[PDB]
Design a protein around this ligand. Structure first.
Ligand SMILES: Nc1ncnc2c1ncn2[C@@H]1O[C@H](COP(=O)(O)OP(=O)(O)O)[C@@H](O)[C@H]1O
Ligand SMILES: Nc1ncnc2c1ncn2[C@@H]1O[C@H](COP(=O)(O)OP(=O)(O)O)[C@@H](O)[C@H]1O
Ligand SMILES: Nc1ncnc2c1ncn2[C@@H]1O[C@H](COP(=O)(O)OP(=O)(O)O)[C@@H](O)[C@H]1O
Ligand code: BEF
Ligand code: BEF
Ligand code: BEF
Ligand SMILES: [Mg+2]
Ligand SMILES: [Mg+2]
Ligand SMILES: [Mg+2]
Lengths: 528, 519, 537
């Protein structure tokens, strides 16, 4: 059916095409793998300009029609989903592999038999790493904090953020400690509001121990800040999801008014009814009101006179963070108030911003709440929007370290240990699986080599050194002098990649290969 | 000047029958590569724009559109094969086609088709009985209860993207055919879930049940996200203030009545609400919503919830914690609820997943699948359904045959030998079908590279000269006892295959005039 | 389905490789062959092929059907040029050399799909032929009437065949009568003499065989005789034209004195007039120029009752002259003079007459000195049948010129095929290997002719094809008892008969070239694995 507008590919060409298509996607992003990497301006068809060293993000934005690329688009994506840092690299390794696989094919090898070869050599490397890796959690407490940081830092060196990487790193380290527990080892990112606004530089990007939100503070006359109300236990605040307006049904209405009788009673009904709420909150003994939905002109004024700063309209996730931040309860009706369901926050101020007529507000807490707000700032949108994703990247590497305190020293060395170990087992293999193992390990070598290429070092050169040194001594961790400094040895240099991620990466590529190779037939149609 | 059909094509003649054959051959040759352990795979990008990659011959022949009447039957018999069996779909067509191919010589030489149809008819009958005759029934005949389901889910999981991670999935596959009552094997219980990302084997086998995270409301984040033995309340409907739907009219002439009816609404909810609290539950699920206020409530008193649960999910939820759906909050008795061994809200593949793991009293599991691309997870789910469905039909029929071309090659033997006793027209036709079966062994070798000619021919000697299970040593390219090598598949495949395949073949050989109407 | 794309290797055109092209070739050859597979055998039938103007032609000559049928595609042209080779070489066997070819590719291809290299199949077919050609000389024989028989069986699939006995006779007769020695021995039967003509009227049977030759012309001026000589006549086979001279292309007549005007002028008439006289003055009663005659220099023949025909077919005069012993007068010269040399150059003919044929009316030079020659004249219902009558009278009368020039025949009837089949088939094991399948295919493939010879009868041909199969299969068991191959098909009745007896004879020289040839094609195509089609201009 639909015979026309339908093409077919199969091996002679086909495989070349695919292999090459991968390779080419790669050639673009290879120049972004490294602490010497570079970003790529991507533009939405609408006109949105972005700038980012993030792998996944780049390949998602490249509006591309080649089917194989479409696959590497997800390859970098899936990895971003599972870890949060692989992206830029997972594809590189994948391509290299493909070129390698292809190469063998023109020497008489079966595509599917290479597949099994790679899957095997891979599983081995994963092990030769799973054995050489080091542990952090089980070693110290002040050193865990350090190592956990020394990763977040290394994880940021390939970003514009790099400039102030000290702060951005210690920020990501903190942001995670404060919302996940050593036992559950679960970092729920809903407990971390990644909000950013413009202004200053990326340096003025602090971490807030509460939340932000945008509010003018209901009535203008209202105060700007909020003290702990004399000797009290910090500040108490109302967290209600009921509107400061006369209660209404939820089924019908038609309050039939026969005569001036009842209309006379409604009259005074709404009137004091506003006092029925304004009083209600005073009774629970609170300082400031945070209502999910707006208030009436009357009800507002009262909140003024009664020194009850208010917050008209606050979104779901919004109101909710104000709870968990201040330890309060989300109170339905008005009469459901009480001094014991209030929010025990530590301060509230209406934050100014340059001359921007916006001027949002903030809710602090002093002590590490169960909610953090990394509030990012920058000289221009793109710097921010990149710095936020840059922050995110690190925050993820911090989450992976609690979910698996295992660490491997990157700098390319992590990939050299495999290439070394996997290549050894090659000589023992002999025959066909010999070519596979050699290949797998050989593709790997492109990872460090690429780092050398970007940092300005002769590839073959740094590789022989990295291989020799990491053999003439111990299948340890000797990385590339990516920036300079004394010499190799990612350890001293403090270059660290979480193991858990590295495994995922060196899998996701081989697997993706294992799929493409099995494809020997293709049938594309058009858009009728 | 008059007409009889209004410009609407329609061909007839002897060529008509030959056109149709060749037509089918195409759709046939198409799948031939996806056969055997070392089988090639396809990548179809339908006019839809959805890109897929698979081996379920059914799934391929479903994406080819195909409109040729004749050649379109190969699409049908391939679908049925993925039904009454679940596997072999690739092959039903290779054969179905191949026969039509071997019918050409006769049809050309000038022989009736009704005679070729008869000839093939017997050929199947004999061939079908022969399989039944070899269907090695066992139970503890040095096979064990698990080693049958494993040994069979394995060989069948071969030649699929899921191969080199075999062990992991066969142990997973069998475990999930057993998860449900072995008295009524219903697939609809093994409900699968796909999760973006992860290794194509970092997949998880939930013992109880796992489902999305429809939890779309404020006030969450409170409510523990983990319980050991919680008191699951598999409730069916509502839990919102104003109600999610349905209403009536409230007309009042008294100011007090207004505020009165209000206080009533509230209490009307809260009651039904505490009515749940009263059941003393830790987990409250409902196929309908759980409003902001509602979920907020349980949140206060450390009770977890989720609104708008997938319909086909609550049913697997019941079967896991052994609850029992309840529509109202009134007569909620305790044998109605359920309890698992452990509940948690994971962050698998950057997606929160509520899951009731550990449930020694379940009759329904759930399993999350992983992959680096929405195409691979997709192929796993189909590569696994082809296995699960074969394990299932291997409980109900502990009768198995060694494929890898053996069963096929042997059924040829007895069929070719038989034809000697017939002589004449029926001889060639029935002897043809015999040779026509050689396509599976034949193709299986070409796909992988083995010397298709020699390995085939060498097999015919030994197999006909004894060894009723000689097939092909996927390993050292050479013939071998596939029963000994443990390449097992239920006989239920082959028997359905040759029945249903031939059907197509004679359905085509029966048509002499094809009248396509235009419009 | 459907090949497409390019990606790398930027080529100015199409290019299919492997399976895709290799099948395309087979399909091609297949179609071009299948059109004419319904014209094979006696039970086979002719077809009408209409053009764009609406006219057409009905014919069974496989070679003309494939010529007339517009074929676009290499492997298609190949079998249309191979069908050509036959009609050009031996002269009959066209329809069949194609059906074989197609069958060899179609088949050989199947072997490749089984994973059998093309070469290993090729050498295999090559040896099957060596053995098959040799064996072909073990069914054939020297001329031991075999002629009126050859000429007959070659009219089975034709229109002329309903009246087989008649034409089968007129064929040999006509040909024979024309034989010559060419140069240094030879004794070749004119691969083209016997001017055939046709005229609509009367029965199909009422076709005359002139006892001399039929030159197709009138008689210049209606004023001269339309029948001359009853005893003896002198025929002037010329070539140079008898019209008023024009001198050298570069011979200006420059007049300086008005005197010379008139003189040189009228001289022109006479110069080529003297030439006329010097010819009548030779006993010329019949003149056959080739380059036409004047009307002036005609009246000279008329005034003298000399049958003189204008601008004749030079391809006839060459044979009208060898037939009256005369001489094709290029230009009266000899040493340095001018004369058609009285009876020295003239020819002796018994009688020259202008017979009519309804509408038409041509000249006949029947009975001559050294003529021996003949010429046939078909008469039918209309041109549509008539073109075809001759069309196959030739595809028949040709079978004879070769049976003669090559004293050796073989029993047709699809016998040759059957024999080779079972012999090569069993012989196929004399090498075993993969190569067995090749020869096997080759042999097996040959049974296409017997199957299709019969299927063209509607009935379940699986009958004869089986019988004839068995027979030879058996006969070659002490090939002892009373060995009896030469057993062909008798489709008219539906049974196996001895064709040598029955009268079904075909020259060895045909089936020997029909075979060696058809494979020469199949192989050059078997080697095709990529077809790059440049873009035209
Ligand atoms: N400071 C560095 N010194 C040596 N290697 C580093 C350094 N920073 C990052 N790398 C190497 O580069 C890799 C990160 O590449 P990057 O460009 O950040 O893309 P992604 O991290 O998204 O793959 C690290 O895993 C490590 O192999
Ligand atoms: N391990 C194996 N070794 C030899 N043959 C096998 C093996 N695994 C499956 N087969 C055979 O391969 C064919 C099945 O092909 P497959 O690609 O699995 O498609 P389907 O199973 O849908 O027909 C059958 O002949 C089956 O017996
Ligand atoms: N009288 C006959 N009985 C059976 N076969 C015949 C007879 N006459 C010709 N044949 C066979 O028919 C074929 C020739 O028929 P035709 O279709 O004319 O082929 P071609 O056009 O190539 O000569 C040969 O196999 C010849 O042996
Ligand atoms: F460049 Be990656 F995304 F850290
Ligand atoms: F492709 Be089948 F269903 F194994
Ligand atoms: F038509 Be055939 F060449 F006699
Ligand atoms: Mg990074
Ligand atoms: Mg299968
Ligand atoms: Mg003929």
């Amino acid at each position: 059916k639909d015979q026309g507008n339908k093409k077919r590919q199969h091996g002679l060409e086909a495989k070349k095409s695919h292999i090459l298509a991968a390779r080419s996607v790669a050639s673009i992003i290879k120049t972004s793998l490294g602490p010497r990497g570079l970003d790529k301006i991507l533009i939405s068809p609408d006109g949105e300009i972005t700038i980012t060293n993030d792998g996944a993000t780049i390949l998602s934005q490249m509006e591309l029609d080649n089917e194989i690329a479409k696959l590497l688009v997800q390859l970098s994506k899936s990895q971003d989903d599972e870890i949060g840092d692989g992206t830029t690299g997972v594809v590189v390794l994948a391509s290299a592999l493909l070129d390698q696989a292809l190469e063998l094919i023109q020497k008489g090898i079966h595509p599917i038999k290479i597949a099994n070869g790679f899957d095997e050599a891979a599983k081995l490397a994963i092990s030769k790493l799973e054995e050489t890796c080091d542990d952090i959690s089980a070693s110290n407490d002040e050193l865990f904090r350090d190592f956990l940081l020394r990763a977040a830092k290394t994880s940021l060196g390939s970003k514009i953020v790099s400039k102030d990487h000290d702060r951005f790193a210690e920020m990501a380290v903190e942001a995670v400690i404060n919302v996940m527990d050593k036992d559950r080892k679960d970092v729920d990112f809903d407990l971390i509001k990644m909000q950013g606004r413009v202004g200053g530089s990326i340096s003025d990007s602090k971490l807030i121990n509460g939340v932000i939100l945008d509010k003018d503070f209901s009535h203008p006359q209202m105060p700007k800040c909020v003290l702990p109300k004399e000797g009290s236990d910090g500040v108490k605040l109302a967290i209600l999801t009921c509107p400061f307006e006369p209660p209404k049904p939820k089924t019908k209405h038609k309050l039939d008014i026969s005569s001036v009788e009842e209309y006379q009673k409604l009259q005074t009904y709404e009137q004091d009814k506003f006092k029925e709420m304004i009083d209600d909150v005073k009774k629970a003994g609170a300082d400031v009101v945070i209502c999910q939905w707006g208030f009436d002109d009357e009800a507002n004024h009262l909140l003024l006179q009664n020194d009850l700063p208010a917050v008209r309209w606050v979104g779901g996730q919004e109101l909710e963070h104000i709870a968990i931040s201040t330890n309060g309860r989300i109170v339905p009706r008005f009469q459901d108030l009480s001094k014991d369901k209030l929010g025990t926050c530590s301060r509230i101020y209406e934050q100014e911003f340059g001359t921007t007529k916006d001027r949002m507000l903030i809710i602090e807490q002093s002590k590490e709440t169960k909610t953090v707000t990394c509030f990012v700032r920058g000289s221009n949108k793109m710097i921010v929007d990149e710095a936020e994703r840059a922050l995110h990247d690190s925050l993820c590497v911090v989450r992976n370290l609690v979910k698996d305190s295992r660490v491997v020293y990157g700098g390319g060395a992590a990939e050299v240990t495999m290439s070394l170990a996997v290549s050894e087992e090659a000589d023992k293999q002999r025959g066909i699986d010999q070519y596979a193992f050699r290949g797998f390990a050989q593709a790997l070598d492109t990872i460090p080599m690429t780092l050398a290429e970007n940092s300005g070092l002769d590839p073959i050169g740094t590789l022989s050194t990295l291989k020799s040194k990491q053999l003439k001594e111990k299948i340890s961790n000797i990385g590339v002098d990516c920036l300079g400094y004394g010499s190799n040895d990612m350890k001293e240099l403090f270059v660290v990649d979480p193991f858990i991620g590295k495994k995922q990466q060196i899998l996701l590529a081989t697997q993706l290969c294992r799929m493409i190779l099995k494809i020997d037939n293709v049938i594309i149609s058009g858009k009728d | 000047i008059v007409v009889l059909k209004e410009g609407t094509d329609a061909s007839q003649g002897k060529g008509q029958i030959i056109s149709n054959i060749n037509a089918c051959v195409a759709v046939q040759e198409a799948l031939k590569p996806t056969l055997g352990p070392l089988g090639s795979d396809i990548l179809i990008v339908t006019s839809n724009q959805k890109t897929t990659i698979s081996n379920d011959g059914a799934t391929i022949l479903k994406l080819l559109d195909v409109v040729h009447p004749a050649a379109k039957t190969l699409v049908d018999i391939s679908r049925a094969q993925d039904a009454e069996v679940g596997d072999g779909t690739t092959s039903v067509t290779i054969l179905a086609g191949e026969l039509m191919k071997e019918a050409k010589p006769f049809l050309e030489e000038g022989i009736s088709s009704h005679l070729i149809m008869k000839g093939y008819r017997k050929a199947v009958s004999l061939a079908v009985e022969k399989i039944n005759e070899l269907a090695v029934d066992i139970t503890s005949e040095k096979s064990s209860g698990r080693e049958l389901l494993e040994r069979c889910a394995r060989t069948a999981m071969s030649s699929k993207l899921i191969h080199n991670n075999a062990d992991f999935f066969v142990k997973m596959c069998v475990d999930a055919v057993l998860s449900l009552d072995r008295n009524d094997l219903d697939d609809k219980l093994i409900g699968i879930k796909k999760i973006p990302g992860g290794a194509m084997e970092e997949s998880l086998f939930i013992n109880g049940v796992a489902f999305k995270k429809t939890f779309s409301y404020a006030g969450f984040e409170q409510q523990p996200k983990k319980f050991n033995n919680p008191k699951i309340l598999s409730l069916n409907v509502e839990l919102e203030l104003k109600a999610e739907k349905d209403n009536a009219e409230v007309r009042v002439e008294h100011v007090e009545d207004y505020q009165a009816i209000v206080d009533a609404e509230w209490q009307l909810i809260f009651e039904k609400l505490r009515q749940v609290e009263e059941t003393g539950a830790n987990i409250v699920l409902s196929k309908l919503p759980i409003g902001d206020l509602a979920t907020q409530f349980f949140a206060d008193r450390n009770i977890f919830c989720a609104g708008r649960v997938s319909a086909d999910d609550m049913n697997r939820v019941i079967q896991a914690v052994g609850g029992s759906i309840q529509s109202t909050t009134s007569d909620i008795k305790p044998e109605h609820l359920g309890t698992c061994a452990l509940f948690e809200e994971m962050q698998i593949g950057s997606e929160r997943y509520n899951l009731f793991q550990g449930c020694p009293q379940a009759k329904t599991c759930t399993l999350l699948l992983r992959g680096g691309a929405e195409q691979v997870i997709a192929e796993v789910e189909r590569s696994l359904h082809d296995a699960i469905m074969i394990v299932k039909r291997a409980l109900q029929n502990k009768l198995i045959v060694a494929g890898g071309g053996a069963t096929e090659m042997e059924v040829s033997k007895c069929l070719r030998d038989y034809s000697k006793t017939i002589a004449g027209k029926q001889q060639m036709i029935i002897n043809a079908f015999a040779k026509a079966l050689e396509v599976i062994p034949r193709q299986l070798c070409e796909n992988a590279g083995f010397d298709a000619i020699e390995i085939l021919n060498k097999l015919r000697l030994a197999h006909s000269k004894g060894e009723k299970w000689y097939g092909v040593v996927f390993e050292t390219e050479n013939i071998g006892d596939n029963f000994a090598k443990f390449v097992w598949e239920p006989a239920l495949v082959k028997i359905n295959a040759l029945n249903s395949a031939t059907e197509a073949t004679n359905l085509i050989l029966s048509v002499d005039e094809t009248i396509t109407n235009k419009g | 389905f459907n090949n497409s794309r390019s990606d790398t290797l930027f080529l100015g055109g199409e290019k299919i490789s492997g399976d895709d092209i290799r099948n395309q070739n087979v399909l091609a050859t297949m179609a071009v062959a299948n059109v004419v597979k319904s014209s094979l055998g006696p039970v086979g039938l002719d077809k009408m092929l209409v053009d764009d103007i609406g006219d057409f032609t009905v014919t069974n000559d496989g070679a003309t059907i494939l010529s007339l049928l517009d074929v676009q595609h290499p492997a298609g042209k190949i079998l249309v040029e191979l069908a050509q080779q036959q009609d050009r070489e031996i002269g009959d066997g066209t329809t069949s050399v194609v059906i074989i070819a197609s069958e060899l590719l179609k088949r050989a291809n199947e072997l490749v799909k089984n994973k059998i290299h093309p070469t290993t199949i090729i050498t295999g077919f090559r040896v099957a032929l060596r053995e098959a050609i040799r064996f072909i000389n073990e069914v054939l024989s020297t001329s031991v009437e075999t002629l009126i028989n050859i000429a007959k069986t070659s009219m089975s699939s034709k229109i002329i065949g309903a009246d087989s006995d008649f034409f089968s006779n007129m064929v040999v007769d006509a040909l024979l009568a024309v034989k010559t020695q060419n140069s240094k021995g030879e004794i070749k039967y004119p691969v083209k003499a016997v001017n055939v003509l046709k005229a609509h009227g009367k029965s199909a049977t009422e076709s005359l065989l002139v006892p001399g030759y039929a030159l197709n012309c009138t008689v210049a001026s209606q004023a001269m005789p339309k029948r001359i000589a009853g005893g003896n006549v002198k025929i002037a086979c010329l070539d140079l034209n008898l019209q008023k001279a024009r001198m050298a292309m570069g011979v200006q007549i420059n007049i300086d004195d008005p005197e010379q005007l008139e003189q040189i002028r009228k001289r022109e008439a006479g110069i080529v007039l003297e030439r006329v006289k010097k010819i009548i003055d030779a006993g010329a009663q019949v003149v056959l120029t080739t380059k036409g005659i004047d009307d002036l220099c005609l009246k000279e023949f008329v005034e003298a009752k000399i049958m003189g025909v204008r601008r004749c077919k030079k391809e006839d005069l060459r044979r009208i002259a060898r037939a009256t012993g005369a001489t094709l007068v290029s230009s009266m010269s000899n040493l340095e003079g001018e004369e058609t040399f009285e009876s020295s150059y003239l020819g002796l003919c018994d009688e020259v007459v202008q017979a009519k044929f309804s509408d038409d009316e041509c000249i006949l030079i029947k009975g001559t000195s050294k003529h021996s020659s003949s010429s046939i004249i078909l008469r039918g219902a209309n041109d549509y049948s008539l073109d075809e009558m001759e069309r196959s009278l030739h595809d028949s009368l040709s079978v004879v010129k070769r049976t003669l020039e090559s004293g050796n025949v073989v029993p047709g009837g699809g016998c040759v095929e059957a024999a080779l089949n079972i012999y090569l088939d069993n012989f196929a094991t004399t090498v075993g290997s993969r190569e067995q399948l090749a020869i096997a295919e080759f042999a097996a493939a040959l049974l296409i002719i017997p199957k299709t010879l019969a299927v063209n009868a509607a009935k379940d041909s699986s009958e004869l094809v089986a019988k004839l199969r068995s027979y030879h299969a058996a006969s070659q068991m002490a090939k002892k008892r009373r060995s009896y191959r030469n057993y062909g098909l008798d489709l008219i009745r539906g049974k196996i008969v001895d064709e040598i007896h029955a009268g079904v004879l075909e020259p060895t020289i045909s089936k020997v070239k029909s075979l060696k040839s058809a494979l020469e094609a199949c192989v050059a195509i078997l080697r095709i694995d990529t077809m790059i089609t440049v873009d035209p201009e």
